[PDB]
Each structure stands twice: as structure tokens, then as C-alpha cells.
Symmetry: C3
């Protein structure tokens, strides 16, 4: 209802400047009604999307010399991802008391047993919690990360896949592709895994979606030194007309800014 005015927006600045109080209002509603699962999820998702689009992403477009401000913005995004993930996780905690202790126990059997309690109704929540933690990890120094948190997040994502492969046009497979391709094999990564996750994504994703093209270029083409594929994929991301998309015009605009940047910086990624 109210989200349409944000998701169909083409003016980034209007969104960036209005989203903060919105986050604050949802946050307050959530704390006033901690057993409302919808509110838990909503506010969690909001922090994670804000963290990406309006904290992390602008930091990425900063110049080499201002790395200090970059690092500080990355640390800021990291904290917001985690706040977002923890807010969404309270939807699972409300539905299954003790969920948080189990899921982060480091005990594989307890992790698996608690994830087996989840149903299709929990898929949205699994997706956002797992995504929040994976997005935080991507900005976490590989030395001071928390393998058990990371492992739990991915297992939540993998559980959502089992439950509901097609969810949000394959959005889960997208986050998994990125995780596997970028993650050290000590933390569960691997390119074979990344490719299979991407194969599932292509079954469900929209032709109007630039993100699966960008994921192909960024997560898969770069590590494999496939500059040809990188270029084609981004040309496909950029061929999409934001005015023609059925919804999420705002996210398409954001993704196309990112693909434009990747193209401009191609020389950084290949030899």
C-alpha cells in the first residue's frame, strides 16, 4: 500500500532521505508488539535493504583515497545488516521459542532438528535472516568472523530452498550463489556449489530482473576470468527498461547503477 510509493520510485535521493524515520517507526512498532511476526520481519528486511542500498553501495562508489570513510561505512552497514538479521530472527523466535539458542548452538544435530520444524510459512523469515548474516560476513574481516553464525545462516538459506525452491523468483538461490562463490572453502564455499545454485536461479528468475545477470558477471565471471561473459551479462542487465518492469522499479534502477559501475571498472577485475 505504502511500500508501492517506495518500490516504484525512480528518485534515489527521495527514498534515501525518507527511509530513516520509516525504519524508526517500524522499529518502534516492533518493540511495542514483539509477538507480531509480520512486524519483526518487516523491520528486519527494511534494515537489510537500507543497509545495502543506502550505506554499503554508496561507500563502494567512493574513491581510493577516501578508504577511511569507506571502511567506516562498511562497518556501519555490517552493524545494520546484523540488527536487521536479528530483528527478523525474532519472528522465528516468536514462532519457536528457544530457536535462537538451538540454531546457534554449534551442534549440527540441534541445528538440523530446529530447522526441520520450519514450514513454508517460515521461508520469508529464513531468507531475510540468512541474507542479513551473509551480507554482514561479506564485510567482516575473514579473521574475526564467526563460523558458527555463518554456517547457521547458510543452513537457514538452504532450508528455505528445500521448503520453497521458487520463492521470490529464486531470490534465495541468488544469495547462495554469491555466498558460495565468494566464501573460502573452509567456510563452506565452492564454485561447483555456486554454479548449481545459479542454475536453480535461472529456472525461476524474471527477464526483467537485472540482478541475476549481475550475479553471473560478478560472482562467477570475475573469479573465472571470463571477461567476455562478464560484458554480455552486464549488457543484458542494462538492456532492461525500468519503465517496463511490472514492479520494483527502484531496485532495478539500483541494480543498473551497479552494473554500470562494474562495466566502468572492468579493468580492475581482469587482465
Amino acid at each position: 500500500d505504502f511500500t508501492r510509493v517506495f518500490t516504484e520510485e525512480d528518485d534515489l535521493d527521495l527514498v534515501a532521505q525518507s527511509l530513516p524515520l520509516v525504519l524508526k517507526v517500524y522499529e518502534a512498532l516492533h518493540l511495542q508488539n514483539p509477538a507480531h511476526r509480520g512486524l519483526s520481519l518487516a523491520v528486519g528486511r527494511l534494515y537489510i535493504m537500507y543497509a545495502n542500498a543506502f550505506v554499503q553501495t554508496p561507500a563502494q562508489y567512493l574513491p581510493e583515497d577516501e578508504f577511511e570513510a569507506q571502511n567506516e561505512a562498511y562497518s556501519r552497514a555490517r552493524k545494520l545488516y546484523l540488527r536487521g538479521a536479528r530483528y527478523a530472527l525474532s519472528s522465528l523466535e516468536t514462532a519457536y521459542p528457544g530457536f535462537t539458542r538451538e540454531v546457534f548452538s554449534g551442534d549440527e544435530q540441534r541445528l538440523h532438528k530446529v530447522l526441520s520444524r520450519c514450514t513454508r510459512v517460515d521461508v520469508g523469515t529464513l531468507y531475510w535472516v540468512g541474507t542479513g548474516y551473509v551480507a554482514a560476513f561479506a564485510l567482516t574481516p575473514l579473521g574475526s568472523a564467526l563460523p558458527d553464525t555463518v554456517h547457521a545462516a547458510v543452513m537457514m538459506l538452504e532450508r528455505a530452498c528445500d521448503l520453497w525452491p521458487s520463492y521470490q523468483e529464486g531470490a534465495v538461490w541468488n544469495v547462495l550463489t554469491k555466498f558460495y562463490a565468494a566464501a573460502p572453502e573452509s567456510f563452506g564455499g565452492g564454485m561447483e556449489k555456486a554454479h548449481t545454485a545459479f542454475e536453480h536461479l535461472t529456472r525461476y528468475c524474471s527477464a526483467h530482473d537485472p540482478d541475476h545477470h549481475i550475479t553471473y558477471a560478478d560472482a562467477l565471471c570475475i573469479p573465472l576470468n571470463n571477461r567476455a561473459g562478464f560484458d554480455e551479462a552486464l549488457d543484458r542487465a542494462l538492456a532492461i527498461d525500468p519503465e517496463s518492469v511490472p514492479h520494483n522499479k527502484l531496485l532495478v534502477i539500483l541494480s543498473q547503477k551497479r552494473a554500470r559501475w562494474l562495466k566502468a571498472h572492468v579493468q580492475d577485475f581482469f587482465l
Copy 2:
């Protein structure tokens, strides 16, 4: 009620930072109640005022070398004017189904017939729609403009004049003065027209209003190389005490910033 806290404000930054979510809320209310004419108009007017005061105007105070950011801000204002004009136009469309097809038909007889259906009740709407389009045109490259849209906008403004000459202390005459003075005579402009429109404005405008002084200096004095009149007029705009005005202190503050800038840049405009 709530508008008083914005219109009597003297702190631009507080307004600039709070207006975006307000725009978003009105916008959402409008889409949730598309037959509410008041909401259509309100949100339209809001976008147009925001576009001017907080997008276009700050761009104008940028330095020569940052023309790129200037051009991008101008394109941004242009899109906001048009969104604003189109929102207000839905008030006319609600009142007279098919209004949009007629008014933009390019057929003078259909244009005139549909405008003849308008009454004094429609004057606010005519004014804002026409203003939005004229403000967009002012930022539109003379080569890629749309004569029929422009012509329809001015005819709406001229119809408001016929209906209600004195509306908002002659505000319509103000926009017309600016259009005629700045518009190529192929697009309906002309200085004789501009002067007559200004003569009507002086009949209705307030002594506490800086805008009619600025319009005289900017639209009329500059093209005619009347530096003497330019200076006097702006001195009159600046003699107004914002603390003494009965209302719209905020707009007076904005206009006086503009007159101060014009004075500082006088050498740009005369020889």
C-alpha cells in the same frame, strides 16, 4: 494546520530534510484514494514546490565547474515538476473524465471546449498543472520540448486568469510573466504579453511579496538591459522583513536568497 509549521519556518535545512517523507505519505494517500481531488492537488503542489525550492534552486547556486552535477539536478527537478503536474492533473481528470486526452489532443477546438467546462473551483488545479509544465519546460532543451504540452499548459494558466484574475494575489500572472518573457515567440512568448501579465500582477500582489520584484528584475529587466530597474527592484525585494509578513515566511526567505544571488551576479546579466 500542519502546513503552518513548514510555511512559517525560517530554517531551510529542517524543511529540506523533513519534506521527503511528507511527499511520500501524501503520495501514498493519493494512490489509496485516487478520486480525492484535494489529495491529488496537494501532492502535486508539494512535488512542484519541493522541486523548485530544494532541487532546482540549490543547483543554481553551484559553481561553474560542477556543471555536470548541475545538469543532473536540473534533469531531476524537471522530472519532479512533471510528476507534480501529472498528480495535480488527476484532480481535473477526476472532475471531468477524458480531460487529459482532450487537453493534450493538439486540437485547438477540443482544448478550448474542455477548458470551457472549468469553473472557479478548478482554478487552483489549473494553476498548479500549468505551473508544473512551464517549470519543466524551462529546464527542457529547446530542441526536445513538446509544443502541444507547453501550449496546453499556458492555455490552462490563461483559463485560470479568465476565471479568477485575482487568484492567490495574482500568482497566475506571475508564472505567465515569466513564461512570456522567457519563451521563444514560436512557443507563444513575447515581451508585450509579458508586460501586460506583469501589469495584472501588480494589481493583486502584496507589498510583503518579494517575488513580484524579482520577476520584474529577472524576467523583464535582464532581457531589456535595464540594470537600473533590476537593482531597484531587488532592493525592494530585500527591504521586506520576513518577521513582519502575515504568512509564508519560508517562501519570503527563499525568494530573498534568490534576490541576493541575482545582485551578486549582476555582472553576468548586463554589460
Copy 3:
């Protein structure tokens, strides 16, 4: 309820960007219900806290060469303090009609008589009004200040002390310490007064509070050239763990930024 999401925040930017519309909404509620004392106070306090944390403080962290922007931001904070003080003062005016004429009469007997009408219920209001005026004075050129306004403000603060010494963990004594230490003895200042006010503060303040440490360093150590004490005090301010505080995490974060700056600039203050 809603204030918790602001006061426990650790992200300054989210607060800074969301507070403006909040100020505007409270302001509108206040004008719509001018006899609501709670609303008068709330909006007053809000302007004063915003003025300090998000106008004055950032100006202070600007570089030497940008003194112009600094001076303009200081003038902006000054006006906001005064708007805030005047909003809170309307709570007293509602409770005791004619309060404003009396309290600013310049007649000591009228000032004292009206302050004698105040009770413990009025302490919050006295504190905020007095603080607003003292904070404005601190940014007012010593030559164009208003001794009677300043004197009335301090007398309001001193009356709150008499009524309720322990109020908000000694917050009144904190503002008085700063006033006395910084104020010319023609305007009522004096270091002996400042020290006694600080002694009262230590009786009531929290170990989790960085502000009393900063006040000791800044108001007392600097004028007395006690660099040793300055350093210890700020080390104490910085030893506090924001994650451990029972409340006002946001203010602790703000104060610790200030103590860090003081330490970095120690050479400015001692020889």
C-alpha cells in the same frame, strides 16, 4: 515508547536524518494544543537536544578554514536553542499566566515572586528553559547579549535546584557548572560557584555518565590549566561501555565523541 528507538540508538546518522520531521510533527501538535504542558515541554526539549547534538556539535568538528560555515551553524544553533527555550517556556506560561512578563521584567522582586510560585512539578520545565537560554548565550557575542534574559534563565535553573536538587541525576548542577565557569563575573559567573555546583553534581550523577567527567575536564580543568586532571577525567569518560549503560546509549555515544575530540585537541587548551 517511541523515544526508546532514538535514545538507545548507536547510529548517529539514522537519528540525525529522522529527527527533523519528528520535530515538525511535535511542533504542529503543540500549536494545535497550546495548553498541553507536556507537548510544550516535549517539543522545547527536542529542539534544544537537536540543536546541540546535530547543529552545534558537528560545527565544532569543522576545520579552522571553514570558520564561515562554522559561524553560520553556530547562529543556526543559537536560534534553535531559543525556539526550544520559548516552546518550553509556554508550559510555564500555561500554568501561570503572565509568567513570561514577570520572569523577564528585570525586576528582581517580580522575578523572585513568580519563581516562588513554582513547584516540583515545574522542575522539568525550569531546567529546559534555563538550559535553552544558557546554551544560546554561550553562542551569543558577549557584547550583544541580554543580561536580563541570561539572569532570568540562571535564576530558573537555581530555582529548580532548590525545588529538586537530585533532578535527573543532578542534570541541573551540570548546566550551572558550565554556566558559572564560562560566564563573565559581570554576568554572574565565578569559579567558586562553578566548583560548588560540580560538588552537588557528583552526589547525584551516574558512574555510567560521561558528561560529568567531560564537564570537569572542559569547564574546570581548562581554565585552571590542570592538564593532568583533564586527561584523567576524559579517560574516565572514555572507559564507559555504551553497551553496558541502562539507558541513553545515544547520548553516551555523543559525549564520548566529544571527549575523544577534546583529547585530540589537548594542545589547544594547555601550554
